[PDB]
Design a protein around this ligand. Structure first.
Ligand SMILES: NC1NC[NH2+]c2c1ncn2[C@@H]1O[C@H](COP(=O)(O)OP(=O)(O)OC[C@H]2O[C@@H](O)[C@H](O)[C@@H]2O)[C@@H](O)[C@H]1OP(=O)(O)O
Ligand SMILES: N[C@H]1NC[NH2+]c2c1ncn2[C@@H]1O[C@H](COP(=O)(O)OP(=O)(O)OC[C@H]2O[C@@H](O)[C@H](O)[C@@H]2O)[C@@H](O)[C@H]1OP(=O)(O)O
Ligand SMILES: CC[C@@](C)(O)[C@@H](O)C(=O)O
Ligand SMILES: CC[C@@](C)(O)[C@@H](O)C(=O)O
Ligand SMILES: [Mn+2]
Ligand SMILES: [Mn+2]
Ligand SMILES: [Mn+2]
Ligand SMILES: [Mn+2]
Lengths: 514, 510
């Protein structure tokens, strides 16, 4: 198999980055590159953005803003299903019928040269035939996730032969893709790193169309992957460290700390504030080694106890999750879950419920109500040990399963600290989880409890039984080749940190609060 | 599955206007075994997990009473550690009742494949190749068919395939049978299926097998209906859901100021004791009716808030089981028990070393004999609500009442709960199959989280009581059906203590 993926661009400058001795080719972003968009989008008069979930709002606005700066005539039109209640939001964002930029999803698909299929993954699974039948012959279908390929594989099917199929997948939530891009207007751009794939190419334009799309989104750097590598790492990652695992970790630790006498206020600060504050900030620009080195000598011992006890139990669940994603089990569960959002078989509809109305999140609201701006959070050693052990276990699973370092680092490190965690610091777990896709929201709900239980049952029990510290795990962490690679990727990161607060209006409508 | 028996008496039972045919058990039927087991000189019991020890002994005991010459031979792989255990149960090489797995399969007329479901999935070809033409393969779970279906495959067309699935843990199959020796029998109800029948012997061989296990009544099903209801049930009310419930309620009660002793009593002791005893012989309605007027209101608040969130998870679980997702996950999980791909081995860990279980050890250390715990109304409401939601899911998914009632009610109260009352969640969960153990671990957390996030939050928010829901619980036809099934239940309650010697070797304590 191939771990790395090279490509050719006649429009953009390809650059090499060496990660742990592995050369990987990438394309750096920047607003200065916007003038190249017309060349990248040759043969494209209309880009049809289908859906208005978490990705579409952001991608559509970023694309339009970029094309406007490039003085391009390419039309970005939003296509929505008939029963959609998102038309008003699209108009608020500047897409409307009077400009010819908002309409029916099928009619939009039919008139598009590039179709960005940004509807729920389960919807793609149950509606691809109609999407295919409406595509113009020789046009381009773009995905932001490889999920549909996994679903087609389960049916022994593939995409039509007469269209190109590409993907540009932002390694961060839609609200962050938009917000960072907006903050980037003051400098030479900002955004969320993206992976791209060229599954099918029927005319030779696929690579540059994908790269142009990514650059237009504001991606600081774009790296190559395949649809399969993307869905395997992605469906897994959100269930792992990005959403599911971090949620399970904070629930498990908050409970342990409060059981042990720590006040609810302090337990919240020592879990959520710690992880979303100092831990993320340090890992974002300095790395995990700098984080460990910022602990006191006694703190390193507590970190070691937590890391040593948490590493394998975390890996157990991650390993399970990854295999369920690769086998097709998880993809099928997501497809069936989407159908259960509606009544059928004489049974009720079961839309996703709220995940932040419980004890620790109610405490979180109180902590934040009186939290001053600029609070960095405490660096509680035990919490850092559990969190970093899970991050390292995820990295190891992805390496052993065959993913590139650019994919591994974005999916297990960069995304958590530069995109997601800032939302949980701002307004709790829901503000983070629920601003992600339906697939990610379902995944977080399904797997967070698994991480909570295994850490409580195994890791914490080991610590309370005086288990010896597995110093080999600690040494492995300290000498891990991923650290240098994380540093290399960090040099590609714009000097703009996402600014998001609780009353942010650039999030899903249902998540807006004031 | 309509069946006809030449040897046994088929009887009708009417459950909510639905006529189902079953076969009543009893030690008095043992003399009929030789006729039932036509063409069977050797029964090869493959494996020595939770079912095999129980089934092998019950079969041998029944055959002896029938004065049958059929040999029950245990077949184990390579250098298995179960040989010593099998010998301790009376099976030996010198008597030809213990031997190599493959050799045992080859010489057997009825092969009981009682090895882990994931192992069946990864080794069925080897099993099939050792089967004699026109021999019979017996399964105690339909999992293997589900796996073959995922491969677009089926069993060989030269053998019969049947199933006798005890609706209770293996240790309970043995224990109840032993307790039933002087009262014309006792046991665990079982479902049976005939997937393939080469010569017409299949039905009676399955029924004989079930009757010999001590089944109070045996009901008909198919391999697919069995795996769909079974893999789901263990993740549901039987193990996963009950575990999630007690964890979530113990946390709520202690958060509210209840002492740990009382929180454990009001959850685990309550459910496994008085609640189970009431449902076992009187029913859910009787349980509700025994509550004071204040108790009924608390019960209603818990039921009204817990019903749908519980159904949400049950619905998801069922569909993952029917689609093939869960079966595939179990097969892959079995492989991760060993090192591969440069990654560590991850055998299942312990689930009873956390806070509430340590409290339970303390609670049981001073528990007087015959103590069945307190009847805590709120706990009853959550538990019964989930029980009723599971029943509804199975109804809407097309299952028969005999199967629904056993998988959602009877097994919980007569087979499983007594073990948790005896020694905690592990004594119950870990005495079940590898598939059930994995399922409980995967789904218990889901029930805990949804009840915490939705049900309990609704109670704290003052959600109004869903009157129609409560009304439907009180008038639900399943209650009368449960009563009918209870009439077939022997007046024998399973006797299990912490030092039980009929459990898995690894679980035997002092
Ligand atoms: N690869 C394999 N090849 C052959 N056998 C085998 C393999 N892996 C596990 N096994 C055996 O499987 C047994 C452990 O499995 P288990 O899961 O505890 O087995 P049980 O609970 O007894 O369940 C048996 C059947 O009854 C139904 O209730 C179940 O759904 C299943 O269909 C052990 O005897 C073990 O062998 P020992 O450890 O005893 O040697
Ligand atoms: N049956 C359907 N037919 C068409 N569209 C559709 C259907 N079901 C959900 N949808 C749409 O799907 C959107 C909600 O989905 P979502 O899951 O929040 O969607 P996102 O987070 O935006 O993700 C889109 C893609 O980017 C990747 O990051 C994802 O993995 C996915 O491949 C809404 O716009 C919704 O329509 P509206 O509610 O806006 O009308
Ligand atoms: C954490 C998950 C995200 C934001 O990267 C994306 O994959 C999604 O599904 O929404
Ligand atoms: C609860 C599950 C049992 C005991 O009925 C059986 O199916 C098993 O898998 O062990
Ligand atoms: Mn992602
Ligand atoms: Mn995703
Ligand atoms: Mn069962
Ligand atoms: Mn089972």
């Amino acid at each position: 198999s191939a771990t790395t993926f090279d490509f050719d661009s006649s429009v953009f400058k390809k650059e090499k980055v060496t990660l742990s001795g592995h050369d990987e080719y990438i394309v750096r972003g920047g607003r200065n590159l916007f003038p190249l968009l017309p060349d990248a989008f040759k043969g494209i008069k209309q880009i049809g953005v289908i859906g208005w979930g978490s990705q579409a709002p952001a991608q559509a606005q970023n694309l339009k803003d970029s094309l406007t700066e490039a003085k391009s005539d390419v039309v970005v039109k939003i296509g929505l299903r008939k029963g959609s209640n998102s038309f008003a939001e699209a108009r608020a964002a500047g897409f409307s019928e009077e400009n010819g930029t908002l309409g029916d999803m099928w009619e939009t698909i039919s008139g598009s040269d590039l179709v960005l299929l940004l509807i729920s993954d389960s919807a793609q699974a149950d509606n691809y035939e109609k999407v295919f039948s409406h595509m113009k012959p020789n046009s381009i279908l773009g995905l932001s996730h490889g999920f549909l390929l996994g679903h087609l594989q389960s049916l022994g099917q593939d995409f039509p032969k007469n269209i190109s199929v590409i993907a540009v997948c932002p390694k961060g939530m839609g609200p962050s893709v938009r917000r960072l891009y907006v903050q980037g207007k003051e400098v030479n751009g900002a955004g969320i790193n993206s992976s791209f794939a060229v599954h099918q190419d029927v005319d030779g334009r696929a690579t540059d169309v994908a790269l142009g799309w990514s650059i237009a989104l504001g991606s600081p750097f774009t790296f190559a992957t395949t649809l399969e590598q993307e869905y395997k790492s992605d469906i897994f990652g959100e269930r792992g460290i990005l959403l599911g695992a971090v949620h399970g970790i904070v629930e498990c630790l908050f409970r342990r700390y409060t059981e042990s006498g720590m006040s609810e206020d302090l337990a919240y600060k020592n879990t959520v504030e710690c992880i979303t504050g100092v831990i993320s900030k340090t890992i974002s620009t300095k790395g995990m080694l700098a984080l460990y080195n910022s602990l006191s000598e006694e703190g390193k011992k507590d970190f070691q106890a937590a890391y040593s006890a948490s590493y394998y139990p975390s890996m157990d669940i991650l390993y399970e999750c990854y295999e369920d994603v690769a086998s097709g089990s998880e993809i099928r569960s997501v497809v069936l879950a989407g159908r259960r959002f509606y009544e059928k078989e004489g049974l009720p509809a079961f839309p996703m419920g709220k995940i932040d109305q419980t004890r620790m999140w109610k405490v979180g609201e109180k902590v934040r109500s009186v939290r001053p701006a600029g609070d960095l959070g405490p660096l509680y050693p035990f919490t850092a040990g559990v969190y970093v052990a899970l991050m390292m276990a995820q990295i190891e699973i992805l390496r052993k399963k065959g993913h590139s370092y650019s994919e591994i680092i974005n999916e297990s490190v960069i995304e958590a600290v530069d995109s997601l965690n800032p939302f949980m610091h701002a307004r709790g777990v829901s503000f983070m989880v629920d601003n992600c896709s339906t697939t990610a929201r379902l995944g977080s709900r399904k797997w967070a409890p698994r991480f909570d239980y295994i850490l409580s049952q195994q890791a914490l029990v080991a610590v309370d039984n005086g288990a010896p510290i597995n110093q080999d795990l600690i040494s492995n962490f300290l000498s891990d080749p991923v650290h240098e690679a994380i540093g290399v990727c960090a040099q590609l990161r714009p000097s703009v940190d996402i600014s998001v607060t609780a009353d942010a209006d650039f999030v899903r409508p249902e998540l807006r609060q004031a």
